[PDB]
Design a protein around this ligand. Structure first.
Ligand SMILES: Cc1cc2nc3c(=O)[nH]c(=O)nc-3n(C[C@H](O)[C@H](O)[C@H](O)COP(=O)(O)OP(=O)(O)OC[C@H]3O[C@@H](n4cnc5c(N)ncnc54)[C@H](O)[C@@H]3O)c2cc1C
Lengths: 666, 134
């Protein structure tokens, strides 16, 4: 993408069309004439471009209007409205930028933000950037939350987020310029090593791989074309739909074998009737030759009737020898037509037991990506966010992702080791009751105009609840919390004294023995400068490996690596770390998924803020007090950092519109 | 529109594999047995036809007559006239068979024979004796 249009695309906006949000703030324009709209669109696109080309410094209205050309720079309320709108909703001046105009002397409004995850930190910075009193409460002793990074000596390995999923349209692209990010690409080639410890041959790989992707497309066909999305009143999961597709392939394999052999028999049984006909003609011939012999034994001279008999029987015999020669013609055709059919047997099997285990690895990878067993993913919706996928190679943070949330936290009032125990919200305001994690009796109360809740979905799910809402969260919100999926996946960090793996290879697989254990240590990354092998636990396995000691788990990692690289090429590991994200109480799992019977629409429910009832009855409708952000709130970018980050930006803009008013509407 | 190429999934088939808990393993076991039934049924006819093949051993070589290679003549020797009548009696109208018997008469010469001699050898009467012998 080139020019102003590239900035629109890079900001996740269509260059040639006004968005639903823009229509809300600029209804005069979009209801108005086509000309004015193109002006708007250009101004917006240009103002973005400017920010993007240098995102380490605030872009002011002046600076913007400066660079604008006529006719566009004529109308300055239009250019002011646009710059204000963008600035508000975090499309420009977000992250870590140098302010030209140091912060307003005094603040307007007080907001408590629960949790200093990337959602929280992003929102906070925006609200403080808008001059509000912002204080974050974190139960942990560190920022970032599900952006963890293990550091020790020169070893650095992310236990939480690790990958920037393309820069094309990604707002982490902007933050990656604002903070130094050693962004190393990922060469995707991943060789697989069965339980024996010997690579699947190239040929094999590609059958199973292609068959895998063919099987997925198949499930989509079931979902959309055959509308196979309910079964017994339960929603269909992706897992089910794969079994069904696989069975239908195994069925088809047999169906064909049956009709191939059932063709052989129909030919074989034509030949049976032909051989009978031929054996009975050989009989009449044998007898009839004897007769013609006997007729020629009669020595001449002979009368004409006995002459006629020889001639007669001679004709009658060559007549029957014609037939039999024309049946041995037919016999030869049908006899080879069997060597034809019995040389072209259709496939013996759909998938052998060896291939079926490799396919299980390709499924474990999918279970790793979606952080959940495939039996849980909605068939109709698991991939709904696939359109908003970014462009470009995926990348790692080589210096450790925690560098980002740390960088965001600078200049923010953050109360670490502070576990929110209860959230009270009323017509007049909110009070948040927290405690000190260390001495749990030591209590805190926080008054504020508004609460922003970035509590992870796993926490929101806890029963009995870790946080109490007063009044309780309404039926519609608590249902959407049940419905949505919170997944899990763990990482094992292996630190060595020396590289014993192919260092031109980033990642390589291990194929499990069973279906049951397809996720157990199924994948390893070498992505770091140092000698670190990162080992992944996905699917059903992840949840069970949390009940096994680190030593045991490290055991099974080495065992595998011996198999692949040799039983004395693999030292002991100097340093080892093992995640248990589902056990961790400030997460209760890894990230969301679209569970069967959920949809994208639940993610929008999760974002919908709550308005309390009126204090005095029959008094007017209050303001919305309790707001929600986090990875689980953004329909189009769930379970990501950029998602969280964007959710934070979003709620900040909304809260600011509420308590500071919106001068940009007109 | 259509599934991936080589993947098979009829509406009808999906319903049939999902209709209960083990409609999957049922339908696939019917086919495992359907196959073994057709598999042995093959070896039955393979064995059966293997015997009928051996009964045709030798072919029909000891029963084959050498070549009569003679030139179709015009005249009807009284010999040939008599061979004809008797042939008509046995064969009726199979002019080809009658031609083959006599040995030196084209198949038209035979038809041509019927019409002119018909009066003198009562050929009508002869084929009444045929058809009655069938
Ligand atoms: C293993 C793993 C790998 C991942 N990999 C990637 C990746 O490669 N790429 C990518 O784009 N994304 C990835 N993600 C997703 C990403 O880490 C998260 O989606 C994102 O950081 C979430 O931010 P959040 O603010 O919504 O929640 P969080 O980051 O959890 O922040 C919320 C905060 O609330 C705090 N909190 C919890 N309970 C309380 C309480 N009672 N009182 C006060 N505070 C509380 C938490 O401690 C936390 O700091 C990954 C996640 C995991 C688990």
């Amino acid at each position: 993408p080139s020019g102003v249009e590239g900035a629109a695309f890079q900001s996740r906006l269509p260059h040639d069309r006004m968005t639903s949000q823009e229509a809300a703030c600029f209804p005069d324009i979009i209801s108005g004439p086509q000309q004015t709209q193109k002006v708007f669109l250009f101004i917006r696109n240009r103002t973005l471009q400017l920010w993007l080309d240098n995102p380490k410094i605030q872009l002011t209205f002046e600076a913007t209007l400066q660079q604008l050309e006529a006719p566009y720079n004529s109308d300055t309320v239009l250019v002011h409205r646009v710059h204000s709108y963008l600035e508000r909703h975090g499309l420009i001046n977000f992250g870590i930028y140098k302010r030209i105009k140091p912060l307003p002397t005094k603040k307007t409004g007080k907001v408590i933000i629960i949790g200093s995850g990337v959602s929280g930190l992003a929102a906070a910075r925006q609200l403080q950037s808008f001059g509000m009193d912002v204080t974050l409460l974190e139960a942990r002793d560190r920022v970032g939350g599900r952006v963890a990074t293990f550091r020790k000596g020169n070893y650095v390995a992310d236990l939480g987020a690790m990958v920037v999923t393309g820069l094309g349209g990604n707002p982490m692209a902007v933050v990656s310029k604002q903070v130094n990010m050693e962004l190393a690409k990922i060469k995707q080639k991943c060789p697989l090593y069965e339980a024996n410890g010997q690579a699947v041959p190239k040929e094999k790989d590609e059958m199973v791989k292609q068959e895998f992707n063919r099987l997925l497309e198949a499930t989509s066909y079931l979902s959309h074309q055959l509308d196979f999305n309910v079964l017994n009143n339960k929603p269909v999961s992706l897992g089910q739909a794969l079994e069904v597709v696989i069975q239908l392939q195994e069925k088809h394999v047999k169906d064909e074998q049956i009709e191939h052999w059932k063709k052989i028999v129909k030919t074989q049984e034509e030949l049976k009737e032909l051989l009978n006909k031929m054996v009975n003609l050989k009989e009449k011939i044998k007898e009839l030759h004897q007769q013609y012999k006997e007729a020629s034994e009669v020595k001449p001279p002979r009368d004409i009737t006995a002459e006629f008999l020889v001639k007669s029987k001679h004709r009658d015999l060559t007549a029957l020898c014609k037939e039999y020669d024309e049946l041995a013609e037919t016999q030869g055709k049908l006899e080879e037509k069997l060597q034809e059919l019995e040389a072209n047997p259709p496939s013996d099997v759909y998938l052998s037991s060896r291939d079926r285990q490799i396919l299980d690895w390709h499924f474990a990878n999918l279970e790793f990506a979606n952080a959940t067993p495939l039996s849980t993913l909605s068939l109709k919706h698991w991939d709904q966010d696939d359109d908003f996928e970014f462009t470009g190679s995926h990348l790692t943070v080589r210096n450790g992702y925690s560098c980002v949330p740390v960088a965001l936290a600078e200049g923010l009032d953050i109360k670490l080791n502070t576990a929110v125990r209860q959230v009270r919200y009323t017509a007049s305001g909110c009070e948040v009751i927290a405690v000190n994690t260390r001495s749990t009796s030591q209590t805190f109360i926080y008054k504020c105009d508004a609460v922003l809740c970035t509590l992870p979905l796993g926490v929101l799910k806890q029963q009995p609840p870790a946080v109490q809402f007063v009044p309780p969260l309404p039926e519609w919100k608590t249902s959407a919390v049940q419905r949505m999926g919170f997944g899990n996946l763990n990482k094992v960090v292996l630190c060595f004294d020396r590289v014993f793996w192919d260092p031109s290879v980033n990642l390589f697989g291990h194929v499990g023995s069973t279906t049951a254990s397809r996720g157990e240590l199924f994948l390893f990354w070498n992505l770091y400068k140092a000698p670190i092998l990162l080992a992944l636990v996905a699917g059903e396995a992840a949840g069970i490996m949390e009940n096994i000691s680190d030593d045991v788990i490290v055991g099974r990692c080495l065992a595998i690596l011996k198999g692949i690289f040799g039983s004395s090429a693999v030292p002991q590991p100097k340093e080892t770390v093992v995640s248990r994200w589902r056990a961790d109480p400030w997460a209760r799992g890894s990230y969301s998924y679209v569970a069967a019977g959920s949809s994208g629409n639940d993610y929008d429910l999760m974002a919908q803020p709550i308005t309390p009832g009126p204090s005095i009855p029959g008094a007017p409708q209050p303001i919305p007090r309790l707001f929600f952000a986090g990875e689980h709130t953004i329909r189009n970018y769930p379970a990501t950092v950029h998602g969280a980050l964007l959710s934070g930006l979003r709620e900040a803009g909304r809260i600011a519109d509420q308590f500071l008013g919106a001068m940009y509407t007109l | 529109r259509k599934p991936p190429k080589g993947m098979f999934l009829s509406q009808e088939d999906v319903e049939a594999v999902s209709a209960n808990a083990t409609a999957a393993t049922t339908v696939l076991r019917q086919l495992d047995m359907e196959l073994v039934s057709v598999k042995r049924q093959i070896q039955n006819i393979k064995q059966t036809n293997s015997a009928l093949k051996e009964k045709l051993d030798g072919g029909i070589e000891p029963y084959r007559l050498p070549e009569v290679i003679q030139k179709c003549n015009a005249r009807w020797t009284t010999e040939e006239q008599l061979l004809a009548v008797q042939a008509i009696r046995k064969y009726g109208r199979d002019f080809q068979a009658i031609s083959d018997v006599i040995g030196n008469k084209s198949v038209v010469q035979v038809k041509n024979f019927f019409v002119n001699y018909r009066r003198r050898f009562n050929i009508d009467e002869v084929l009444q004796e045929w058809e009655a012998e069938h």
